[PDB]
């Protein structure tokens, strides 16, 4: 009953620490990844803008 219920609890919250500690790593890591995804995208767009610039120039140099 109640003695075992309490024991279950101090066992549960003991484990809760490492759960949080892990999640904190995993969330930081994922945030990291997503950030690096955005960054990578921004570099591509810049590459597209450049390729886009160059083809307007060719079109004007040709027709």
């Amino acid at each position: 009953e109640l003695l075992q219920r309490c024991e279950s609890l101090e066992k549960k919250t003991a484990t809760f620490e490492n759960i949080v500690c892990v999640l904190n790593r995993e969330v930081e890591r994922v945030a990291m990844t997503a950030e690096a995804c955005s960054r990578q995208h921004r570099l591509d767009q810049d590459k597209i803008e450049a390729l886009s610039s160059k083809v307007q120039q060719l079109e004007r140099s040709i027709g």
Binding site: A31, H41, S52, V55
Partner: protein
């Protein structure tokens, strides 16, 4: 009465854990939004790409 003092100890730690998790929850969300945004702009970006391939094939064939 020291088991009620244990239980107090736990209640407080649990509050900290639940608040940290709140924050982590928020972090994950900002990641999702930054991400879903990056992924969206990159669909319009694949459109510009296919347009550029076509424009460029055109130039290849009037040479």
């Amino acid at each position: 009465f020291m088991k009620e003092k244990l239980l107090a100890e736990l209640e407080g730690k649990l509050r900290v854990f639940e608040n940290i998790v709140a924050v982590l929850n928020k972090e994950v969300e900002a990641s999702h939004l930054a991400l879903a945004t990056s992924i969206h702009q990159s669909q319009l970006d694949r459109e510009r790409i296919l347009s550029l391939e076509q424009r460029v094939v055109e130039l290849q064939q009037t040479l």
